[PDB]
Structure 1
Amino acid sequence: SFSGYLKLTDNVYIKNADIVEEAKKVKPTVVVNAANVYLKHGGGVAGALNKATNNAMQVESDDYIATNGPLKVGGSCVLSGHNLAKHCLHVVGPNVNKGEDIQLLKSAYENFNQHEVLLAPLLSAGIFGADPIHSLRVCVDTVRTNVYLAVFDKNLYDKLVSSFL
């Protein structure tokens, strides 16, 4: 199914790739979105996944929020994967630029354990402002199911690999 991944642990794998491109190729059962509590898919991974759905993901998401209200930081919901995947798991990692508590990162990753296999980004990295190296440590220390991590930036990929303990 997946390919070109480096194995980090028994269950965690990583690759230098565009998560949208990976999703489009693999069409996995579950792709993880790096969402906010409003499911406003404006930038980063969410902006790119949404754009690849021709905005279908935002329309669905808007209906979800109208019905159920916002998520919590550290929480998730399962929505349609649209053209990218069977399902999308929207997970809200803390945004430290908004002062959100980093301890909620472990909670965010715990969501992954409800799914046997996921394609995912590193949570709370990029514009969420946390250190990607930390994020990856929490990932491997929390996730017990099979996770294929897509890291867009090659320099960051190299640093994550070369620094992995």
Structure 2
Amino acid sequence: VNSFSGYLKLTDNVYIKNADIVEEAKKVKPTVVVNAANVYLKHGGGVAGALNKATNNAMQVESDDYIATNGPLKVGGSCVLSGHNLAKHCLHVVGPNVNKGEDIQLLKSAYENFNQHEVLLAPLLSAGIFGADPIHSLRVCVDTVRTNVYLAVFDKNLYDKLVSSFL
């Protein structure tokens, strides 16, 4: 039993809710919140900007030190950093950016990072400004993640649609 309230059960291990990931994190304080990161951990907009803004830019400050030490992440890769006021940890995961021409097949590699954590609050990867189709992102998620994932989809029209076409 966990505290994730009001989630629809899609599969044995995937759950979904129409909610702002920032609000889910503030409410649940999960062990892991996933950020839809880029390779530079520049948290400008979308999920990352919203998460970072909610930390009062502390996520960005921490991230800049990470990059200075380690260099950019790989597309498909991840790193674990602090969750600040939102969660214990933030798993920064880089999905491929379709607008940059990055290989959508790297989306599966990106989701594999979730399997290192028993429970996660997460967005759909490669959606939004990353260019990919969220219905496809949900499919890859279901077919790749085996741990317990709670998807927060901050778009009621999209939330309702994802359910209606899910195979």
Give the TM-score taking structure 2 as reference length: 0.98
Instruction: Please show how residues 63-82 of structure 1 align to structure 2 within 5 Å.
Output: 63-82=65-84
Q: Distance in 1 between matches of 2:96 and 2:164?
A: 26
Q: Name the counterpart of 1:130.
A: 132
Partner deviation per Cα, 1:52-95 (whole Å, 9 max, x = no partner): 00000000000000000000000000000000000000000000
Deviation for aligned residue 1:164: 1.0
Q: Distance in 2 between matches of 1:152 and 1:30?
A: 18
Deviation for aligned residue 1:154: 0.5
**Helix, strand or coil: the match of 1:97?**
coil
**Helix, strand or coil: the match of 2:81?**
strand
Instruction: Please show how residues 24-103 of structure 1 align to structure 2 within 5 Å.
Output: 24-103=26-105
Q: Distance in 1 between matches of 2:121 and 2:35?
A: 9
Give 5+ residue unaligned stretches, structure 2.
Answer: none
Runs of 4+ off more than 4 Å: none
Partner deviation per Cα, 1:90-126 (whole Å, 9 max, x = no partner): 0000000000000000000000000000000000001
**Helix, strand or coil: the match of 1:24?**
helix
**Helix, strand or coil: the match of 1:91?**
strand
Q: Distance in 2 between matches of 1:6 and 1:162?
A: 13
**Helix, strand or coil: the match of 2:166?**
coil
Partner deviation per Cα, 1:2-50 (whole Å, 9 max, x = no partner): 0100000000000000000000000000000000000000000000000
* Percentage of matched positions with identical amino acids: 100
**Helix, strand or coil: the match of 1:123?**
coil
Q: Distance in 1 between matches of 2:56 and 2:125?
A: 24
Q: Distance in 1 between matches of 2:35 and 2:148?
A: 16
How big is the alpha-carbon RMSD for the aligned residues of Structure 1 and Structure 2? 0.3
**Helix, strand or coil: the match of 2:99?**
helix
**Helix, strand or coil: the match of 1:96?**
coil
Q: Distance in 1 between matches of 2:5 and 2:166?
A: 20
**Helix, strand or coil: the match of 2:75?**
coil
* 2:138 is aligned with 1:142: no
